[PDB]
Amino acid sequence: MIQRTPKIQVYSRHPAENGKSNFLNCYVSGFHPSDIEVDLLKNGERIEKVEHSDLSFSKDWSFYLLYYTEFTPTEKDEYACRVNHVTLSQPKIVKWDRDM
Amino acid sequence: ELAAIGILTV
Amino acid sequence: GSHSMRYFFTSVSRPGRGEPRFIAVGYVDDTQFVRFDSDAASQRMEPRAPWIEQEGPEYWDGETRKVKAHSQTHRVDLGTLRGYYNQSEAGSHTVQRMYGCDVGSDWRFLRGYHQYAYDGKDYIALKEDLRSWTAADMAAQTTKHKWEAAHVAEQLRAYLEGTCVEWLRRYLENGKETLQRTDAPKTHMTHHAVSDHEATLRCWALSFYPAEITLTWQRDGEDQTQDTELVETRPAGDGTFQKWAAVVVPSGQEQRYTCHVQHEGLPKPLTLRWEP
């Protein structure tokens, strides 16, 4: 039984401009098995209207998924991605950095 | 299009 | 350039929770065009690209029937593999299958593939000659003998070398506006002061297609990997990709570093340098 922990990247579709509509993405990859929980958060509260891509995998058989939501960034609001998987003894929260 | 041949159980 | 059509299938057992989850997706190059998901309301193969929607009801009925047949064979496989490895009923297991073909610039067959994995590991794979099999262990050798007896390699060879390449050519023509395009990366560099002793430079590549790209850093014209960070190429969500690479440099030495970007859309590799 192979277990691989996921890599997580949180970023915007377009360069963030405060007050301008955009998409917030959480990309999870390199994981196995496929069951994974991914939630996008705004100021610590889960965002409901989130969509995701169809599960696929890489040359090494590890899985990847993109989760995304429409949003408008501001200077004060904090966004993050929360991920849980069997390899994590505790859910991982990755904060959005507009330059990463 | 998907394959219609060569897909058999292991 | 070269092009490819690939289909990916995943089946996951659900101990004490019924039928296995089944997901199938199809790609031409780095662009998804179809999907089937057993949890979906439709229970049909569905379009995920504008250019495949034009295909008639004959197409969708046929793909739906074939994808449901792939789902049923995986359903049986999960049961067979549990037996082959004498695994208990309490655990969840995964089967993955991938197949497809590559064509060259002339749109002629280059190579074909068909690989299978169980629990994230190679189980059996068709060799590049499309005539023989590589089996990972003794359980997979049982499957290899069944598949040799049923001439599975010869069937796949006919599909990969015929049907696969003919349909890929067709999709490449119907989705020409989408599929035969190359988007060169839009690039820039950012700078962040971390301390009065170090700073970070981040080189960005955005809105590019296809996904293959190379980002490298040099210090005084010498390749540098130490103190560098490179993130996996990631999808923007709009059909293009993104990537960045960063380096931590001594404060005031920023201009000694250069970021180099290679991509199919770039006649010449690009060179960037921090310019305030």
Residue numbers in the entry:
A (entry chain B): 0 to 99
B (entry chain C): 1 to 10
C (entry chain A): 1 to 276
Give sentences from the paper.
The T-cell receptor (TCR) recognizes peptides bound to major histocompatibility molecules (MHC) and allows T-cells to interrogate the cellular proteome for internal anomalies from the cell surface. Here we explored these issues using phage display to generate a high affinity TCR derived from the MEL5 TCR specific for the heteroclitic version of the HLA-A*0201-restricted primary melanoma antigen recognized by T-cells 1 (MART-126–35) peptide, ELAGIGILTV (A2-ELA). This TCR, α24β17, bound to A2-ELA with an affinity 30,000 times stronger than the natural parent MEL5 TCR, resulting in picomolar levels of binding. Remarkably, although the enhanced affinity was mediated primarily through new TCR-MHC contacts, α24β17 remained acutely sensitive to modifications at every position along the peptide backbone, mimicking the specificity of the wild type TCR.
